């Protein structure tokens, strides 16, 4: 699947310089391109080859070669540079198949922390009129991406019927998560309140909904 070796993850401090390298015996015949991919989007070409760049690519991106190793250097890395970077070239032997690198997750350190935005929704009227009940707890815009989600029935913990995602990066380098609590309309109406507790960097945000 992959033919050129890249480091799966590298880090750089905001404003510093990072060199993402791409190595393989397949490289020696053609120029290496670099593609950038933000979460949820198709790749975007950042280096045609040699040191040529398309429109909309800042000058701080550059390409270089040293035999069987191509390199993408980012001088003065910014927050918008956090993405996955893929080198690509053609095999110099045989029918010249296309050769991809494994990809490199770039992390830019020093970005500002953010407390989670928590939105809790009760089961809708139409869902209850259909004998269903689901509580939706939406967590967004927290950085770093470490967060604990916990549910409460009145004041007691509940674990059955809870489906939680792992945190995933948003397009603005912050993180998002979701937790769904599935109950019967009897379980929903037989309690005074339900709570979604969200802990992030030692601090907790708690939202509460009731059959009102």
């Amino acid at each position: 699947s992959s033919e050129l070796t890249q480091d799966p993850a590298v880090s750089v401090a905001l404003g510093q310089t990072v060199r993402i390298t791409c190595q393989g015996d397949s490289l020696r015949g053609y120029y290496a391109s670099w593609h950038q991919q933000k979460p949820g989007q198709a790749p975007v070409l950042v280096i045609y080859g040699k040191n040529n760049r398309p429109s909309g690519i800042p000058d701080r991106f550059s390409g270089s070669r040293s035999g069987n190793t191509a390199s993408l250097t980012i001088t003065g890395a910014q927050a918008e540079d956090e993405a996955d970077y893929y080198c690509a070239s053609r095999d110099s032997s045989g029918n010249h198949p296309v050769v991809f690198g494994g990809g490199t997750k770039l992390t830019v350190l020093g970005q500002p922390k953010g407390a989670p935005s928590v939105t809790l929704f009760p089961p809708s009227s139409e869902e209850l009129q259909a004998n269903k009940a689901t509580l939706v707890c939406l967590i967004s815009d927290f950085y770093p991406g470490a967060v604990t989600v916990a549910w409460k029935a009145d004041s007691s913990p509940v674990k059955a019927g809870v489906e939680t995602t792992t945190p995933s990066k948003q397009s603005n380098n912050k993180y998002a998560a979701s937790s769904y609590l599935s109950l019967t309309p009897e379980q929903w109406k037989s309690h005074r309140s339900y709570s979604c507790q969200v802990t992030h960097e030692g601090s907790t945000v708690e939202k509460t909904v009731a059959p009102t």
């Binding site: 699947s1 929704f121 939706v136 995602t165």
Partner: protein, 231 residues
């Protein structure tokens, strides 16, 4: 001006054959460029499938050659992919793209030794499963006095129990893009997905404006437009 658009089935039974088509506008697939197919399994990197030039000449990944076929319809400005004997390893997002011409001999100008993918499609998701498709149940997440944050308020749509991915959500037929956040889906123990889309709007304009979420689930050929009214 060149735009690509993939189209496919979304769900393919194991040992079946995956068939996709990439339509091209603003360019010609009969050119000397290499109109390619790329795929990306969820949580993994890009893998090259094949390419086709002038609508005739083909070149495939050595590891996939035994079951890959790439053809072109020069009259409809399309090129297609056929992958037979599919397994769960073929579950991926499939992109069509365009590579430039090149030389196989070392005797050409410098312009002919590049490889790059400067034009991509949005990509279509393909899942190889024996399970059946299920359309989504869309419920409104109505705004209340606890979904408010002063001047703004949050309302949304619950897209529940569907299979397979993906589901796209727009608001008011795409006229409302500001404040929209469609959360990534959750894979439940039932094997079905669920996600929620939430848009932030002025709390004063709740009763004076209609908000409808547009939920498209192509693997089931279903579109749900659910009106969201205040609680």
């Amino acid at each position: 001006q060149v735009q690509l658009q993939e189209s496919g089935p979304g769900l393919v039974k194991p040992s079946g054959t995956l068939s996709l088509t990439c339509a091209v506008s603003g360019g010609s697939i009969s050119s000397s460029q290499w109109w390619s197919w790329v795929r990306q399994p969820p949580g993994k990197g890009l893998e090259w499938i094949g390419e086709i030039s002038h609508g005739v000449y083909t070149n495939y990944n050595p590891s996939l050659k035994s079951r890959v076929t790439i053809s072109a319809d020069k009259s409809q400005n399309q090129f297609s992919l056929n992958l037979s004997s599919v397994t769960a390893a073929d579950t991926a997002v499939y992109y069509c793209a365009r590579a430039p011409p090149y030389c196989s001999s070392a005797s050409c100008p410098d312009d002919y030794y590049y490889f790059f993918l400067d034009v991509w499609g949005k990509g279509t998701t393909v899942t190889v499963s024996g399970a059946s498709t299920k359309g989504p149940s869309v419920f409104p997440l109505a705004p209340s006095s606890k979904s408010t944050s002063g001047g703004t308020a949050a309302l949304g749509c619950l897209v529940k129990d569907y299979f397979p991915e993906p589901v796209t959500v727009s608001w008011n037929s795409g006229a409302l893009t500001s404040g929209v956040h469609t959360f990534p889906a959750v894979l439940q123990s039932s094997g079905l997905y669920s996600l929620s889309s939430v848009v932030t709007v002025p709390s004063s304009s709740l009763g004076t404006q209609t908000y409808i979420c547009n939920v498209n689930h192509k693997p089931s050929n279903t579109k749900v437009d659910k009106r969201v009214e205040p609680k």
